[PDB]
Amino acid sequence: RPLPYECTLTSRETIRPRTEPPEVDGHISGVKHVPSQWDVPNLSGKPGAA
Amino acid sequence: ALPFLPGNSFTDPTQRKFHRSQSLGYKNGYALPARPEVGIGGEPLEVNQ
Amino acid sequence: MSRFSRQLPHLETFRSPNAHHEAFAHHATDCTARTGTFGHGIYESA
Amino acid sequence: KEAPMKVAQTRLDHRTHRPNVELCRDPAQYRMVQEVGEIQDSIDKLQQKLA
Amino acid sequence: MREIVHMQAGQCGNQIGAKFWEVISDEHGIDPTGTYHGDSDLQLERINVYYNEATGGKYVPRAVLVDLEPGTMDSVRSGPFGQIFRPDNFVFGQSGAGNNWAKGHYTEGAELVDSVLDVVRKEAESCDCLQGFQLTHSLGGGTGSGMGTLLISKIREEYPDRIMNTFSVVPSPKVSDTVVEPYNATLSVHQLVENTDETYCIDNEALYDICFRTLKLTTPTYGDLNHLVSATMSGVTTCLRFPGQLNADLRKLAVNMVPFPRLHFFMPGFAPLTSRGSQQYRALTVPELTQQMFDAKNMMAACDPRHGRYLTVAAIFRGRMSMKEVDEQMLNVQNKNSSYFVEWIPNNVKTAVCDIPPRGLKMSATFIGNSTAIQELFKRISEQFTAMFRRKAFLHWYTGEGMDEMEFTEAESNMNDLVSEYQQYQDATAE
Amino acid sequence: DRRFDLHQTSSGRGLDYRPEYYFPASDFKTTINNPLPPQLAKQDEIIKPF
Amino acid sequence: EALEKQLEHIRKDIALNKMSTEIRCTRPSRERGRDGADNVMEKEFRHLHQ
Amino acid sequence: MRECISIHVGQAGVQIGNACWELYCLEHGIQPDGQMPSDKTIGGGDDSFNTFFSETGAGKHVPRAVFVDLEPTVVDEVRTGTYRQLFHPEQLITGKEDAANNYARGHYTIGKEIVDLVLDRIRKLADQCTGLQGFLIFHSFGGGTGSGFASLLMERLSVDYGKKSKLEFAIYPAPQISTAVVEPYNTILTTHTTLEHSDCAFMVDNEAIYDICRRNLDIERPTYTNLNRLIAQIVSSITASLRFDGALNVDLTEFQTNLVPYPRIHFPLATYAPVISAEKAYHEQLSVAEITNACFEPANQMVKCDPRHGKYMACCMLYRGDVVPKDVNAAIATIKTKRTIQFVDWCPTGFKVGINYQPPTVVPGGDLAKVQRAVCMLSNTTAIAEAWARLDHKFDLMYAKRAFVHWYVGEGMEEGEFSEAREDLAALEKDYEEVGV
Amino acid sequence: SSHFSANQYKQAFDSRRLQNSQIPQTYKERPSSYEGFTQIIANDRGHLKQGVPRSKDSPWGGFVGTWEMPKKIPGNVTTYMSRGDPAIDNIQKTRAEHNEYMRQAVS
Amino acid sequence: EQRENDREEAFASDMIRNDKISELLQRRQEQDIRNLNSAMNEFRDLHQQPEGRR
Ligand SMILES: Nc1nc2c(ncn2[C@@H]2O[C@H](COP(=O)(O)OP(=O)(O)OP(=O)(O)O)[C@@H](O)[C@H]2O)c(=O)[nH]1
Ligand SMILES: Nc1nc2c(ncn2[C@@H]2O[C@H](COP(=O)(O)OP(=O)(O)O)[C@@H](O)[C@H]2O)c(=O)[nH]1
Ligand SMILES: [Mg+2]
Structure with a gap:
C-alpha cells in the first residue's frame, strides 16, 4: 500500500468516476457545476452580516 | 463538527427557559415511568416521534 | 430582669462537663476585644 | 431533508392568510425563507453525493 | 462473554453515569434511537459487556438508575441520549434524601432497596457470565452515600465472587458543597472499605485544576467533568470491549494493584489533555503520553503523590503503539522517580494495551494509582469529622431517624485504621 | 366581572397584570453556527481508525 | 485603641509562630528531633499567650 | 411530583402570597385566569408547574396555596381583583373578627375557631399532592394571626403530619421600626410554641430591606409591594431547583439538615443578590465572585444583625442563572480565606451549594434589574442572639410593670405562659451563647 | 378493619404512596392460623356474653376534637440528643402529660 | 516506514484542524456572550426605566 491504512488516496474534491457517469437528476460525478464565488461570508460587522 | 473529546464540548448560551417536565412520577400507589414528549426547555424531542 | 438571668442552657453540646468548664474558662477571657454581645465577634480592627 | 421543506412551505403559505394589518414582515418570515434556501442547498449537495 | 452491570445512585451518579453511557454509546456507534450506526465490526462484536439486544439492531444499556427522589433522573430522560435507557430501570421514590446518610440508608432507603434488588437481579441473571458491578455515586450526600452503601452491601451478599467497582466522588479539600459531608463520607467509607473490590476516588478540585491548567476552559461546567470521569471509565474497561496486544480486565487490575484487601482506593487519571492552542506545540509520542500520565496535576485526586509513595500503578494505553516503547517508558519513569515507589515491590506497574483509541485521537492513556497519599484525603475527612463530633453538631438528625453513636465511633476508628495502614506501608522498608 | 377601582388600592396598583418578557429579541443570532473558513474546513485525513 | 493595636500585634506574632512551627515541620525526617530552638519557640508561645 | 403546599397566614402572609x-x-406562563396562553401543545406542554399548580381535567392551573386571615378585608381584596379566578375560593379562608394583635386571641379564641376548616383544606391539598415535599408557611412575628394561629396551626400540623418539612418564612420585628406595641409579647409567646414544632424558619425583617431599597435600588421610599416582591424573589430562588434543571439540585427536606446544627437553633437569615436597579447595573460586570462578596457584605443582609458580631454555623448558597461551578468554588474559597467572615471552629465544612440554570425572571414594571445570575444567601449565625437579647429586653421592660397582660388573661391565656415563654427564650439565649464558643 | 397484607404488593398500598402524608394506622399484617370450631361467644342481639374479657376502651372509639386537645403539645422530638438533663426530664414530663390527657379524654 | 510517517502526519494534521476549530468556536462563543450582554443592556435601557415602574 503506498499510503496508510487509515487514509485514502482520493480527497473530498477528488471523487471522480472511472466509467461513464450516469445521469442522476442533473448532477454528474466529476463535474463541479458553478464555483459560486459569491458565497464569501460578510465579515464586515454590519447588522445582518455573518 | 468536532470529535467527541472532553475539551471539545460547547453549549448554547441563548437558551432561556430551562424547565423540567415531570415525566417521571407516580399514580395512585405505583411507579409510572411515562414516555417523554418534551425535553427541558419545552421543545418537543427529536428521537422517538 | 434578675428572675430570667440565672437559667442554664437548654442544649448540652460539650460531652463531658470538664471540656465545657475548660472552654468557658478562657472564653470569658476571650470575650474582651470582641464585637457585640457574648464575645462571639471578630477582634474589631486597629 | 424532504420533510422540513414541507414544514417551511406550509408555514409560509399558512402565515400568508393573515388579516389586513397582521400581514407583517416579522423577523421570522425572513429566517423561514433562508431555511427554504438552505434546505434546497442541502438537498442539492446530497443529490450530488448520490450521483 | 463477560458483562458489567452499571448502577448509578444519587443526582451526581445519575449525571456522571448518564454522561458515561452517552460517551460509550457514541464510542460504540449507538445512535440516540438505540440502533447500531458504526462502521467497523469491532464496535459490534464486544457490545454485550454494556448493552442488551432489544430490537434487531437496537441495543439498550444495562444501567440501573437509583434515586430517593426523581430529580436529575427526569432531566437525564429528557436530555439527549436519554431514551436509550430501558424505561423500568428507573427506580425512584418520592421522599427526599436531604443529604442525610441515614435517610439514604436506613429509613427511606429501605422502601426502595427491594425494588432495586429486583431490577438488578433481573439484569444480572440474564447475563451468561457476569463479571461485576460498577457503581457511580458521591460520598457527600444521602442517596449516593446511604443507598449506595446499602446497595453495595446487598450486592456483595447476593454475589460474593464478582468485582465491585465504585467511583464515588469524594469531598473536596477546599469548598464543601454539603455541610454534613464529613459525616456522610465517614459513614459511607466505613462500608466501602469492607465491601468494594476497588474504588476510584475523584476530587472536584482536582477536576477544576485539570480544566483550568491543562485545558484552559474558561467555562468548564459539570459536562466536562463528567466527560473526564467517563473517559476514565472507558479507559479502565476498554480491554473487555476491544482486542489488544496485552489485555487486562477488571479482575486482572484488582489482582495487580491491591496488595492487601483493605487498600483499594485509587487515583484515576486521563491522558492526553491539551490546552486549546498547544496541539501544534506538542508532538504525540509515548514518552510525553507517559510523562503526562505520571504528572502530579493530571490525576483526578486532589492528594499529591509527592506526599506519599506509589504502591501500584496501572497504565492502560489505547492506540497503535510499540510494546518496547511502553515498557521502556514505564521502566524509565520508575527508575527516575525511584523515591515515589515502594522499594519492597519491584515493577509497581501493570501495563495494558488496547488497539482501539477513542475517535479523534491517535493515542490515549488511563492511569490508575494506588498510593499512600490517600491518607491525606482520609485524614482531612477524619479531622473534619472529629471537629464536629466532639460538639455533636448536625447529629441530632442521625440520632432522630435512629442510629447510635457507636456507629460513628466505629466508622471513625475504621478510617483511622486505614490511615494507619497507609502510613505503615509508606515507611515500611524491605530489609 | 372585573373591578374597575384597583388603582385606589395599593395591591391593585402593585399587582396589576402585564405579560411576561422573553429576553432575546427576534433578531439576535449566534455566530457559533457559521460555516468555517476553508483552511479549517478541510477533510478528515483518517477514515478507518479501527 | 493603643492597647488594642498592641493586642493585634500580639495575635499576628502568634500566627507567625504557628507558621514557623509548620515550616519547621516541613523539614526532612532525618533531622527532626527536639532542639533548643524548638524549646525557645515553645517558650515564646507561652510568653505571647501570657 | 415535587409538590409544595403554601400556607399564607395573616395580612403579611396574604400580601407576600400575592x-x-x-x-x-410569570415564571410558569400562567395568566390570571388559570389557563395557558397557547394550547396544550405549544407554548407549554411541560409538567414543571406541578410543584405549585395542580391541573384539572381541562387544563386550568390552580395554586397549591391556602390563604388564611381573621379579618376579611385583605382576603376579599384578593378575591376581587386581578387574580380573582386563579386562586381557589375554598382556599381563601377568612373570618369575621380579627385577632387584633393578640397571640392568645389567635391561639385559643378565633384562631381556634377556624383551624378545623384550615386543616380540612390542607388535607384536601395534601391528598391532591402525590409526593409532597413540605409546607411553606408565610407569616409575621408581629401580632394576631401571624403569631397565634400560625403557632396553633403548626402544632396541629406536627401532630397529624408527623415529621414533614414545615419551613417558615417569618417577618421578624426590626430593632428600631416596629408597628404594634404588644409585638414583643406576641413574638415571645409564638417563638416559645414554635421552637419545638418547626424544622427551619427563614427570618426576614422589614428595616433591612428598607435600607437595601434606599441604598442599592434608589427607591428612597419603598412600600410593602416592593418588600413582598423581594421576599417572593427569595422564595423563588429557594424553590427553583424543584422546577428547573440545574447542576446541583436542592430540595426542601435538605434545608433543615444543612442549616440546623442543634435543636431549637433553626432561625437562619436571608439575603438576595444582586438586588440593584438598571442604571446601576449598566456600570457593573456582575459575576460570581462579585455577587458572592455582595452576599457576604454586612449591608445586603435582609435582617438587621451584622455578621461581624457572631460566628457562622451553616451557609446555603443558592446560585441561580448562567453561573459556573468553577467560579462558585473560587468565590467560596476566597470567602473562606477572608477574615471578616468568621465561621465557628467545630464546622470546617460550612457551605452548601445549589446551582440552577434558570436565569432570574423579572416582573414587568418591577424594581429589580434583569441579571444573568443571582444568589440566595441563607446563613445560620450567632448574630441573631443580639436580636433575641434586644427583644427579650423589650419583653422584660414591658413585663416588669405587666402592661398589656390583662387583655391576654381576660380573654383566655394563663399568665404562667408568659413566664415559661421568657424562660424558654432565656434558655435559647444561653444556647446561642454556648454554641458560639 | 382488616388491612391484611399483599405480599409482593406490600411495596404498594402504602400511605406514603397513596397520597396520605398523615401518619398511618397499623393493622395486623401476616395472618395467623386457627384450629376450628370457634366459639359463638355472642347472641342474636349484638351482646357480649357473661365472662367474656370485655375491653376497657371507649365504645365510641378514640377521637378528640379541637376544643379538647391539650393546650400544649410536646412536638415529637424522638431524639433525646444534644439536650440537657432537665430538658430530657421536662420533655418526658410533657410527653407523659400528653399521653395521660389523651387517655383520659378517650376513656 | 514512509507509511508510518504518513500515518503520524495525518493524525497530527487532523488534531491541528480539530483544536483550531475548537479555538475558533471559543472566540465565537465569547463574541456571543459579548453580544448577549449588549442586548441585555439594551433591554434594560428599553423596558426597565423608573418611569415605567408600578
Ligand atoms: N414585608 C411585609 N411585612 C408586612 C406586610 N404586611 C404586614 N407586615 C408585617 O406585619 C406586621 C403587622 O402585623 P400583621 O402580621 O399584619 O398582623 P396579622 O397577621 O394580620 O394579624 P392581626 O394582628 O389580627 O391583624 C407589621 O409589623 C409588618 O412588619 C407586607 O405586606 N410585607
Ligand atoms: N463531578 C461532578 N460532581 C457532582 C455532580 N453533581 C453533583 N456532584 C457532587 O456531588 C456532591 C453532592 O452530592 P449529591 O449527589 O447531591 O448527593 P445526593 O443528594 O444524595 O444525590 C457535591 O459535592 C458535588 O461536588 C456532577 O454533575 N459532576
Ligand atoms: Mg390582620
Missing part, C-alpha cells in the same frame, strides 16, 4: 403567586404565574 407577590409570590404573581411571580410564580
